[PDB]
Curated annotation (Swiss-Prot), chains A, B:
<dbReference type="Pfam" id="PF11486">
    <property type="entry name" value="DUF3212"/>
</dbReference>
<dbReference type="InterPro" id="IPR038074">
    <property type="entry name" value="YfmB_sf"/>
</dbReference>
<dbReference type="InterPro" id="IPR021579">
    <property type="entry name" value="DUF3212"/>
</dbReference>
<protein>
    <recommendedName>
        <fullName>Uncharacterized protein YfmB</fullName>
    </recommendedName>
</protein>
Length: 108, 108
């Protein structure tokens, strides 16, 4: 069981929420755990496996460092930001802190 | 975003860990987020989607109550317990508390 800081869980959670809201905007309702997963891979080449592992701490990963586990999550951010508005962003940030209960730093 | 108590996240996390360790016993290494998922459905008729939602709080569910969200998770427990030993159990219990940092009550 590898250790992942709350700030790491935070950024990882945003990714999931950005891509989610992007789903619930395109579709009318809201995603499915497995659904949203395929949606983040085929549409944004995002690796949900990696992302969920960081959150739940379940499962291991290869590039398990810090500088890496960052440029990777941030890479996803930059990829989604363009398609999300201000509200969507703030909404996911709120939900993240709500899930982690302190302010955290967003990767890049 | 539905609310799920830590005690709910706890039991939900055990399920994932029991089925996981059962995987890393059968296979030599350790699961994959998506892998372990199929493994819990085909081998134990366990609904990982439901379980993960409770943990990460991501995604919604239908039978979102308490008495229900219990007899369901507990149903999974009883299903896995038979195949797990004492160490495996204690190991998952420890990892759970480690992920939630208090002692919690295990469903049935």
């Amino acid at each position: 069981m590898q250790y992942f800081s709350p700030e790491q869980q935070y950024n990882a959670w945003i990714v999931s929420d950005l891509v989610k809201q992007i789903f619930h905007k395109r579709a009318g309702c809201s995603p499915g755990i497995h659904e949203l997963a395929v949606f983040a891979e085929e549409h944004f080449h995002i690796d949900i496996d990696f992302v969920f592992s960081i959150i739940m701490n379940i499962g291991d990963i290869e590039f398990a460092l810090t500088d890496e586990i960052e440029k990777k999550l941030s890479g996803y951010l930059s990829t989604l930001l363009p398609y999300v508005t201000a509200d969507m962003f703030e909404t996911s940030k709120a939900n993240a802190h709500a899930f982690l209960s302190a302010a955290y730093h967003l990767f890049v």
